[PDB]
Every structure is written in structure tokens, then in C-alpha cells.
Design an enzyme around this catalytic site. Structure first.
Site, PDB file in Angstrom:
ATOM      1  N   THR A 161     -60.299  56.100 -17.754  1.00 46.64           N
ATOM      2  CA  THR A 161     -61.739  56.059 -16.954  1.00 46.64           C
ATOM      3  C   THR A 161     -61.568  54.957 -15.727  1.00 46.64           C
ATOM      4  O   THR A 161     -60.608  54.150 -15.882  1.00 46.64           O
ATOM      5  CB  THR A 161     -62.680  55.619 -17.843  1.00 46.64           C
ATOM      6  N   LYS A 189     -61.250  60.238 -15.022  1.00 46.39           N
ATOM      7  CA  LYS A 189     -62.345  61.038 -15.123  1.00 46.39           C
ATOM      8  C   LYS A 189     -63.342  59.977 -14.686  1.00 46.39           C
ATOM      9  O   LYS A 189     -62.913  58.679 -14.580  1.00 46.39           O
ATOM     10  CB  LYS A 189     -62.859  61.025 -16.594  1.00 46.39           C
ATOM     11  N   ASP A 191     -67.073  58.609 -14.398  1.00 43.35           N
ATOM     12  CA  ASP A 191     -67.927  57.681 -15.405  1.00 43.35           C
ATOM     13  C   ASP A 191     -69.247  58.762 -15.740  1.00 43.35           C
ATOM     14  O   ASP A 191     -69.450  59.762 -15.097  1.00 43.35           O
ATOM     15  CB  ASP A 191     -68.370  56.520 -15.265  1.00 43.35           C
ATOM     16  N   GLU A 192     -69.987  58.793 -16.815  1.00 49.87           N
ATOM     17  CA  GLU A 192     -70.899  59.373 -17.292  1.00 49.87           C
ATOM     18  C   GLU A 192     -72.165  59.620 -16.365  1.00 49.87           C
ATOM     19  O   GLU A 192     -72.728  60.636 -16.095  1.00 49.87           O
ATOM     20  CB  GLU A 192     -71.361  59.247 -18.658  1.00 49.87           C
ATOM     21  N   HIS A 282     -68.979  65.795 -22.474  1.00 45.19           N
ATOM     22  CA  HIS A 282     -69.401  64.715 -22.908  1.00 45.19           C
ATOM     23  C   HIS A 282     -70.485  64.624 -23.616  1.00 45.19           C
ATOM     24  O   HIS A 282     -71.191  65.505 -24.015  1.00 45.19           O
ATOM     25  CB  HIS A 282     -69.564  63.561 -21.664  1.00 45.19           C
ATOM     26  N   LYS A 322     -64.573  51.070 -30.247  1.00 46.38           N
ATOM     27  CA  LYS A 322     -65.770  50.263 -30.139  1.00 46.38           C
ATOM     28  C   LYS A 322     -67.134  51.025 -30.291  1.00 46.38           C
ATOM     29  O   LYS A 322     -68.049  50.514 -30.336  1.00 46.38           O
ATOM     30  CB  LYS A 322     -65.779  49.398 -28.984  1.00 46.38           C
TER      31      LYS A 322
END
Lengths: 462, 100, 462, 100, 118, 100
Positions: A161, A189, A191-192, A282, A322
Site C-alpha cells: 500500500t 494499491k 488507499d480505500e 475491498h 492489527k
């Protein structure tokens, strides 16, 4: 015809009924208010979802209600808890529209969750009959076709990322992507939440990422790709972005399935199948809906719905990362995702035998808070067919980006070779990592720096 | 430096590790296949085949001898091996055995 | 540049910061694990949403981080509970894309909900700055234009739902609709999951409903409408259904916003503004997301998001009906929905002063499990501008449909006249209803039959 | 003759002018960066980086030594120096120092 | 619109306009801006250079192209058409576009610097 | 039977209730307006006005007298009363007073 109020349990409680190979089944876990009998509550759950209403009307006599009504055929108590029961419900096939996920979701989980007579409710599993699953499109490409097109065999795929999340111009974005790619990775990629901001418009990002991809592919000699984000406010805007993504020859794009809606996702899957570009999904917002244990929707049902709608890559937790994930449930619903024939096993969180009828698989993805020392164990859990993305495991290398990418690639290869030869990863992972880092300084530096960090936290969902 | 797909970061693999590769090939039911090629472009998919897959393989020494013969006759070309699966219908392992 | 793991609380805890008229604020209610300081947890919530990462990377130094980073500027404890705190978070405006709700949702509630250090989390309110709210389209028509177009003043609008859920063919659907229209009602609706089934295809339903509406309007002399459902798997199918709905001249259609997606909803709002057809929005699945008190999203944030995206009618609970709703929160977020300037009042569940900048209002709707005896109190709570839909209050009349519709309309009008004259509805509702039913036999029959049913259930959300 | 962007029509720059260049580089808080590349096409944007930007710059002689090392190890390639800004996020100065 | 034509005013002149943020957020803004333009054209550290083609009118297509090519190869960056050159009986727009494109391509190949023309 | 919007299903309204309606019309600042029309189609929006809205309303008897005059001169037509708001800019009360 006799108007008035009627009890539910006198009509919708049939324990003699037997499921058919056509009916659609669902499993609920529910806890009612004190003083409410369990059977009445299960009858209400099966009632308000198919035909029920608080009073009987004359039009009810105009049709064959018994043919369409839902049925609640099994209520049982779960060991270790009080006033909590499993209720199974069956629905005939003529309830649902062919080839639509939105209708199924609205019909099943539309209104029942807001019932007053229920303290907590949670949908656990959904069984899809073959006659219904034959209608849907399925994933655009699958696993085998994706592997063949990208020409990558014998190892899990790697990704990274771009960080920080927001604040980079177009050219610096391209430079970071190029540096990450030339080191030995395979995918990078966006980010969202990067769609289009005042500091970085989408066209420039697409152009620069395409240039970096082309230059790196020419330099190294390996097919390299990058996920271009598409999430847009309108169907037209997303279609335009997809068309431009095709024009430049990029081989893969991404989309946020839960926050944009299943309608947009289905149309994007159809377009991707028509034009043959791999589709990445995603899993944003999932923690709003699957976190708690007593209320919400378990993830595996969303995974099945997505596999019906369409997608090649799907986020699937990290176990040791995480983000929240328990090993048993993760393995169970990963096997739910990939395989074709799966038998009932209550120990892995799967409740019903489900058959896909040769619908291709969907590749799981693990990402979030992992580094080099997590390589062995990870490879043990997922198996070979998986895609691992290192968030801070590559850019955080004290020597830039390319050393981090090279270290990641060597570590993953060494783990796959150690299991390839016949050694046990779990018991000897430290030895394998040290031996691999003996000769390549970057791997040794990563091992030395990132051996002190561990995330050991209690699991909420037990 | 130009890379050549998987196992392209190590020092050259020894013969014993290649034998390990071969018994791993035969253990789960994959069959070997030998290919040779001149160019190594990443935009090409098909490679020239060498006879047929050895369905009745019985020992890694057979695959080693076949690779040796391929090197003997076409030594001026990149030589690689691959594994095939008859259940899922998809090749699984591919790596380079004879660099230039 | 120095790589490593870095504690959050030093960078994302600034209590000296002051909000600006441009920044976007949010309020979280959270409960952390034992042994976790509250301030560190709040810093984690702020950091992971905008630019945070578990380890610093070199690229972090290539931009002006201080300009974009989110900030957590207030943590307080709530009286009556332990290990539960409110955390306020601010974001600069350059964070978000202009005119898109999906980007805002993904950026804010994307990943934070799945954090280890948090036992439970729940978003409470969102403040929209004027500079951002000016970008969006707003509701297609609003309240004033809708009232003017439909030529209806002085009374709340009335509606009903077709029963049972499924089982009727097209012609009998039309027959029931015509019978219910001619009694004195105004609006009737398709039911949420009716899109297209093997027993009843959509074109026939549209045709027959249009014919019935035309005949009833010609017969009585009132502008009469009906919601045609549009929910479809793909953008193309929904567009086609909307075009056909326009061609026949129907004045209103409906759509499910949460289960279809904000992208599809935004494109539908844009199209229906372009072609001038009223839009009706249903709140399906909301019970999955707002039921609990400690985890999920409160409904008012969804209401604000919808008012940003576009919609004229919005389901808003029933207070005394069959679905969960508390009077205080219902009134608070209803006033949030309709008004233009709303000042902060923690007593009604609103946390920030929000200004809409003349964006038109959205009509709330109460539906589900109400009958005649609920008319007075209901009219007191909502005021004049509201739409009440009776599920079983019309068809359940033992005399068919038209007597039920006539009784409902007479009861509502008598209540509005009684409040109009100067009487108190709450204290004299029984007397008003009896006097109204003195001369109209249908109202008397409904009053006699439906005085025995009451729904008194404890509220989960306190 | 093929040209090489800005500062490319002068007689070759002396070392003292390079030192003054670097002093002005650091005067307004811009940070240096070293790139080396083989070809000089005008449709290529990205170049290969060398180490990291020297955020702890304290003297022009440090960047001079960095350029000397870059020439020592990759002297057969074009070597150029760029500068970055942390507030406007866009680079400002670029020129060629080492020619083949 | 109408204020400037008033009787009670002998002279009037607008001096400044303040745009509130809530309104300026609506508009599109410039297509690219400064930073993106500089990044795309790969030109840093110096002001950009330009030139007009003279005389105003009277040149055919090929002479236009030759002048543009000659001026571009010297070391400039931009050359522009003149304000009133749109389409005249002596020189249409398609031939001018074609010839300018050919000259741009040849000069860019010859020198090695990204070159453009308005 | 043809119906005429709200308050059209009650038996005919008495004069005292009309006076109460008018005083409630004046209470929160709505102003009266009188319209007359020949036909009662449901696709027509505008009706013919009579004088102007009575901004100086001081008693319901004034509006009642105006309606009486309206019936006196144009009694062969539908006659109705509306109320106007000056804050939200939208009429709120509309009912039929004189039927033929």
C-alpha cells in the site's frame, strides 16, 4: 374471512417439515425479552420476513398462502449461555428474484432485526440452493484464469500500500509506486478513500501510475500491475473511470463493494467480464456490521453474497495482524470462499453443505500490520493460493523502498522453499529466516529491526 | 538485473534441491514437463514443448536425465520445467533450471 | 527520517485547538479495553481515520502532514457509566471529495471500528460545514414544491400498504389498489421486496396500477398517486424501470437506499430531478445498524447523509407502533430532518449547530402497526407536514377496503379539525374520536373493533 | 546537438558555481536528491533514485561528496541533481551534473 | 447588469469582488493548475519562453510550419497562433493544424526536449 | 360523489366553525385570500382571485362579510378560501365554503 389478531405459533411452527434440495435455508441466533417463549419468538422471526403482519386481512384468502409462507422448523439452546437460541428457517424458491442479491438481502434481513419482542439477533449462515446459484454471473475470472493471465505460479502473490494515506501529489505517487515495483513486488494499491481530492485529481494519478507500470515492466521483465481505485458517486462516473482504465491497458482495478452498494458492484462485475479486466474488491465498513457477537451479521454471509455478485480478490483478515480475526472462523470461511464442495462442520463455523456448481473461486487476501517475522506462520495458514500485502513492511525499511521489497520477496520465497522441501514452517521459522538473511543484507536488516513488535490482544468475538 | 519469475533471487540451486523439487512434484500427483525457449519476453505465454509429459515417472533421476539430454541437444536456449495437475486443471510450479 | 513504532497520544492530542467554520466534526462514544488510557485510545481513533499508520515511513516527510492530519480535541466521561467516554474529532475540509457521500463514509467509518484497543464504538453525530453542503445536489423537490405540485394543504398525507406481502397477481393487485384508492385515501405503496418474481412480472404490475390510478382519479376528482418500486440489480435495469414509470405519467416512485447503495441512489436522485418525478426512500436494513446502544451507527447520521444525497419521503419510526423508537430521539432527528437552522441541544440527541443553507426539507413518514386510536397522539407529535401510512388499518376493516379508507380519512380529518379549533388532542382524544364516529358507521366500527390492541414494550435504546 | 533540459547551453559548470547552487538550494529549505539514469528520452518521467533525500544536510561539501560517490560507482550513466519542497509539494530545480 | 446605466450617477466603476468560500467551493477551478502543468511538461528552475508568429496574417500552411520549426529548434519552448487567426480564405484550420503537428514532432525528435504549440 | 380536497367528507360546516377557522388563520400570521371558479378539474392549479389579500385583517367578521359579498355577486360558482404564509412562502389552509 375473520378479521382480528392471531398468534404466530399456531401457523408458522412446523417441526415435522423436511428441507428440500430447492428451498433456501437460514440460521439465526437470537435472545428474546424475559417472559417471551422461545417458540413464539422463532415463529415471529419466520413470520415478519415472508408474509406476516399483526392482523389478518381479507386479501390473505385470495392466494395460496401455504405455498409461499416461510417456516421455522428447529429451535435449540446453545450450551454455555442462557436465553439464547438457534432458530432455523426455510423459504421456498418462488420467494426470490433470479439473479439479484439486493432482493435477497431486503427480503431476509429487511425488517426482522427491528422487532420489539427480540433483545438481540444475529444471522449466522445462508445456504444457497443450486437452482438459484445457477442464475448469477459469478466472479468475472476466478482463480485459474487469473493465474494463467498473470503468469505467476508456485508462490503467493505480493502487494504493498502507498503511505501516507493522503497528501501526495501525482508525480510523487508515481515515483513511490515505481520504486516499490522495481524492488521485486507484484502489486501496489491506492488507499480505500483516495477517489479524487483537491490536491490530486484522478486523471493525473492514472496517467502517472500507468507510466510507472510500463517503465518498471520494461526494466525488470515481469508482468506488473496496480489497483486503480474506481469508487465514484454515480454509475456514469464509475463507468467513465473504468473506460479510461481500459484504454491505457492497465490489467486490474479495485472497488469498495459494501459502501458503494451491491447494484454498482454487480454492474461493474458485468462490465469487467465483458471487457476482461481483473476486479479487486475491498471490504470497508465490515467492522460496523460483524464486530459484536450478539448483534450484527457474521462476515461469511457477506462473503457468500459477494461471491455471488462477483469478484476476484477479497480481504479476509490477518489472524496475527492489527485487524480482528480468529483462526478457526478465518480458516472456515476461507475454505467456504475457495473450495467447491464443503460439508457441514460446526467447529469451523460452517452450518450447511453448500455446492457452487463449478463457479470459480475467489482469492482471499491478508493485509494490515504484518512484517517479515509473520511470513512463516502466515504461509502455513492460507496455503499457496493467496495474496499478502505489507502495509508498513516495505516502505518502512530504513533504506527506502527497493531494499524493503527485495527483503519481502526473499523472505516469502525462502518460506515457500522451506515448506517446498519438506520442513515444518511453524517449528523452524526462526531458523529459516536467519539462514535466508545470512546472505542478503536487506533481509537481515529487516529481521533485526522488526523482531520486537508483537500484537497479542484478546479476541472480542469468541 | 533481469529476473526470471520464481526462484530468481537465490544463488543457483544445487542438484539435491532440484531432486527435492522433483519428489515434491510427484508426491501430490503433478506431472513434469520440460520446455525450452530462446526469448524471455513477459508478453509471451506459450513455450516450445519437449516430447510429452512423463506420466509414468518413477524416480527423480529420470527427470534429471531428461533435463541433461535437453541441455545436451539445445544448450543455447533457456530451459525450464513445469508441473501439471489433472484435478483442478492448472499448472502449479514453474522455475528456471538452465540459464544461459 | 527515523523509522519505528510511535505512540499516538503525543501527535493527535491537542486540546488547545479550536474548530473553524470550515472543518468537519464528528462525535464518537467508545469503551476501551482495561489497561488502555482513554487519551491514547482517542488519539488512536483520530489517527487511524485520516493518516495514521503503525510505523513511520520516509514518504511521511515529503508532504505537509500537519495540514491534513485529523485531530482529537476533547475527551469527556458520560455520567452513569464506567469506561465509556465521548471523543470529538475534527477534520480539515481538504480531506473530502466534493459532492460524494460514499467517500465521506469510507474515510470516516472505514477501518476504525475494527480496532483492538476499543471494546465498543458508536458514531453519534456529524456536523456538515456550509462550504461542503453547498456542493451536493440536495433533495430533488423538497416539501414546498411537492405540496404545490400535489395540491394538498391543511392535513397530513395518508397512505396504505398492500397486503399480504406476496401472493397476488397483477390484476388483483390493481383491483386492491383501485378499491383502496376510491375510499378516500391518497397514496398506496408496493412492498419492499416486490421487485420481479416468477408469479408477477414488473411490466404488468406497472400497467395495471397505472390503469387503476387513472380510473380512480377520473372517478373521484383528487390527484392520486402510487409508489412504483424500482430496486433492481444493475444501474441499467433501474434506469429502464424509471423511464417506463415516466412514460405512463405516474408522479411518484420509491427506492431502497441502504440495501442498493449510495451510488445508485445518487444517480436516481439526479435523474428524477432532471425529469421531475418525486422520489420516495425506504429505510430498510436500518435495524441492523442502529439497534444497539454501544455499537453501530445512530439513525440521525444516516438521515443527514440521505438529506445530502437526495430524497423527498423518509421513514422515521412510529413511537407507538410495532418498531423500535424513543420519543425524544425521534423528535430530535425529525427536527434535524425538516428545519433549516437547528441549535445544539443535548436533551434531544443533537450535538452540533447545523445549517443547511436553504436546502429544501424532507418529509418524514410514520408507518407500521397503527390503527384509528393512534390518530390523535400521532398528529400531536409530528405536526401538519407528515405522511401517515396504515398497514392493517384500512384493509382490516371487516367491510372490505373502501370502508376502512373512509374511516381512516374521517378520523384523521376530525383530529386535525379538533386541534385546529383549539382543543387539546392528548387529553380529549377519546371524546373526539367517539364524537367523530357518532355519525359515520365505518369509523364507529373501526373504533369498536380496534380499541383492545396496545403495544407497550421496553425500549432497548436508552 | 541533443540538449539536456535547464542549464544545458552553458560551458560546463565549475565546482564553485555548483557550491553556490547548492547553498541557494538549502537556503529556502529545499532538500537535495540524486538521480542517475541510462537513457535521456524526453517521454520518460521517473529516474532511479540513490539512497534517500539528505534531510540532515549541513554543508554543500556533503552533497558534493555524494555526487563524487555517485560518479565513482555509476560513472557511465547520466547523473543529475533535483530539489524538493515540503510545503508546495512540487520540485523546483533540476539540472545535469555528470555526462558520459 | 443595470446599475451602470443610472441617471443619478455621473461615473461608476467596480473595483473588487470578495468570493465567499461556500460559493468558491462549487466551481470547477482551472483544469490543471501550476504544479500539475510543471510536472507534465517537465520544466523546472526557469520561466517558460514563448513567441508569436509574424506578420499577423498572409502566410500559407507550409511557410507557417517552416517558421514554427525554425523558431522551435533554436531553444524556445512555446509558439502561438495569433489572436485573429481562426480560418481565412488563404489558410484553413485543418492544414495549419496538420503542419504545426508535423513540425512539433520533428523538432521534438531532433532536440530532445518536450515542445508544444498553442 | 365528486370531492373537493380536505374538509370535504364532513357534513356542511357551520358558520361558527368557519369563524373559528378564520381566527386560527389570522392567529399565527397567515393572511386570507378568496378565490372563485366555475369548474373543479383536478389538473388545474390556478383559480381566479378577488381583490387582494386582506393585510389589514382585524376581525373574522370582515372576512365573513367579504365572502358574503363574493357569494352575492358570483353565487353560481365554486367559492373557496385559502391562507398564505410570508415566512416559509407556502399556503397552508384551503377548503370549500360555497358549493352550487
Amino acid at each position: 374471512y375473520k378479521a382480528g389478531v392471531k398468534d404466530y405459533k399456531l401457523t408458522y411452527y412446523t417441526p415435522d417439515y423436511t428441507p428440500k434440495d430447492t428451498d433456501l435455508l437460514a440460521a439465526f441466533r437470537f435472545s428474546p425479552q424475559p417472559g417471551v417463549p422461545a417458540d413464539e419468538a422463532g415463529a415471529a422471526i419466520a413470520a415478519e420476513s415472508s408474509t406476516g403482519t399483526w392482523t389478518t386481512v381479507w386479501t390473505d384468502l385470495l392466494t395460496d398462502m401455504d405455498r409461499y409462507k416461510g417456516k421455522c422448523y428447529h429451535i435449540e439452546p446453545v450450551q454455555g449461555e442462557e436465553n439464547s437460541y438457534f432458530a432455523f428457517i426455510a423459504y421456498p424458491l418462488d420467494l426470490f428474484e433470479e439473479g439479484s442479491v439486493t432482493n435477497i438481502l431486503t427480503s431476509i434481513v429487511g425488517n426482522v432485526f427491528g422487532f420489539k419482542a427480540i433483545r438481540s439477533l444475529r444471522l449466522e449462515d445462508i445456504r444457497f440452493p443450486v437452482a438459484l446459484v445457477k442464475t448469477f454471473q459469478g466472479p468475472p475470472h476466478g482463480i485459474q484464469v487469473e493465474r494463467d493471465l498473470l503468469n505467476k505460479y508456485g508462490r503467493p502473490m505480493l502487494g504493498c500500500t502507498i503511505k501516507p494515506k493522503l497528501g501526495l501529489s501525482a508525480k510523487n505517487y508515481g515515483r513511490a509506486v515505481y520504486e516499490c515495483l522495481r524492488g521485486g513486488l507484484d502489486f501496489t494499491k491506492d488507499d480505500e478513500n483516495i477517489n479524487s481530492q483537491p490536491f490530486q485529481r484522478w486523471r493525473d494519478r492514472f496517467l502517472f501510475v500507468a507510466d510507472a507500470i510500463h517503465k518498471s515492466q520494461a526494466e525488470t521483465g515481469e508482468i506488473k500491475g496496480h489497483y486503480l481505485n474506481v469508487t465514484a458517486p454515480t454509475c456514469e462516473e464509475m463507468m467513465k473511470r473504468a473506460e479510461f482504465a481500459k484504454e491505457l491497458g492497465m490489467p486490474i482495478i479495485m472497488h469498495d463493494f459494501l459502501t458503494a452498494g451491491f447494484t454498482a458492484n454487480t454492474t461493474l462485475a458485468k462490465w469487467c467480464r465483458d471487457n476482461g479486466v481483473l476486479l479487486h474488491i475491498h471490504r470497508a465498513m465490515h467492522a460496523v456490521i460483524d464486530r459484536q457477537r450478539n448483534h450484527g451479521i457474521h462476515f461469511r454471509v457477506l462473503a457468500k453474497c459477494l461471491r455471488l455478485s462477483g469478484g476476484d480478490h477479497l480481504h479476509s483478515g490477518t489472524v496475527v495482524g492489527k485487524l480482528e480475526g480468529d483462526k478457526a472462523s478465518t480458516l472456515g470461511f476461507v475454505d467456504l470462499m475457495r473450495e467447491d464442495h464443503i460439508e457441514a462442520d460446526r467447529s469451523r463455523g460452517v452450518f450447511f453443505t453448500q455446492d457452487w456448481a463449478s463457479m470459480p473461486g475467489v482469492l482471499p487476501v491478508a493485509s494490515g500490520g504484518i512484517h517479515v517475522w509473520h511470513m512463516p506462520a502466515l504461509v502455513e495458514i492460507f496455503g499457496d493460493d493467496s495474496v499478502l500485502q505489507f502495509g508498513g513492511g516495505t516502505l518502512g525499511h530504513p533504506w527506502g523502498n527497493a531494499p524493503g521489497a527485495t527483503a519481502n520477496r526473499v523472505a516469502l520465497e525462502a518460506c515457500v522453499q522451506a515448506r517446498n522441501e519438506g520442513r515444518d514452517l511453524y517449528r523452524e521459522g526462526g531458523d529459516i529466516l536467519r539462514e535466508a538473511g545470512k546472505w542478503s543484507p536487506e533481509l537481515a536488516a529487516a529481521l533485526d529491526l522488526w523482531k520486537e513488535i508483537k500484537f497479542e490482544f484478546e479476541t472480542m468475538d469468541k | 538485473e533481469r529476473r526470471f519469475e520464481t526462484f530468481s533471487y537465490l544463488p543457483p540451486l544445487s542438484d539435491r534441491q532440484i531432486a527435492a523439487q522433483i519428489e515434491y512434484m510427484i508426491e501430490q500427483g503433478f506431472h513434469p514437463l520440460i520446455e525450452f525457449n530462446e526469448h524471455s519476453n513477459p508478453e509471451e505465454f506459450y513455450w516450445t514443448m519437449w516430447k510429452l509429459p512423463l506420466f509414468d515417472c518413477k524416480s527423480p533421476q529420470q527427470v534429471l536425465d531428461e533435463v541433461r539430454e535437453c541441455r545436451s541437444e539445445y544448450g543455447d536456449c533457456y530451459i525450464r520445467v513445469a508441473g501439471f495437475d489433472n484435478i483442478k486443471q492448472c499448472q502449479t510450479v514453474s522455475f528456471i533450471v538452465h540459464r544461459p
